[PDB]
Design a protein around this ligand. Structure first.
Ligand SMILES: N[C@@H](CCC(=O)N[C@@H](CS)C(=O)NCC(=O)O)C(=O)O
Length: 105
């Protein structure tokens, strides 16, 4: 799983890796769902509807370090899992990461 995630994560683009089954990944879908992100800039990547599930997480691991669900990526910069994203949203550092790249409206 190399060109898989690398082809989706790009500067000024938000992408979330989830597993439709664990409520934590859903939390990431629930929050960023309320974020005024540009057009098709925000997405939700179900590493299950593509097979090689372990290959992507195995890649998320080497790409970032943790293989937990979810796995968000503001631009090519990873922010962490779900508990990581929220910590940033309430802190406001999140929208900032979106601002420096212009991922928001
Ligand atoms: N709370 C974690 C995410 C929670 C999570 O994803 N836990 C389980 C699924 S809910 C996990 O990732 N398991 C990885 C596996 O099953 O291999 C974080 O924010 O990093």
């Amino acid at each position: 799983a190399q060109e898989f995630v690398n082809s989706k994560i790009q500067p000024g683009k938000v992408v979330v890796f989830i597993k439709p089954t664990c409520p934590y990944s859903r939390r990431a879908q629930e929050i960023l769902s309320q974020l005024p992100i540009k057009q098709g800039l925000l997405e939700f990547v179900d590493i299950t509807a593509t097979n090689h599930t372990n290959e992507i997480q195995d890649y998320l691991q080497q790409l970032t370090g943790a293989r937990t669900v979810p796995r968000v990526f503001i631009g090519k910069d990873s922010i962490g899992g779900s508990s990581d994203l929220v910590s940033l949203q309430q802190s406001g550092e999140l929208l900032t990461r979106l601002k420096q790249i212009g991922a928001l409206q």
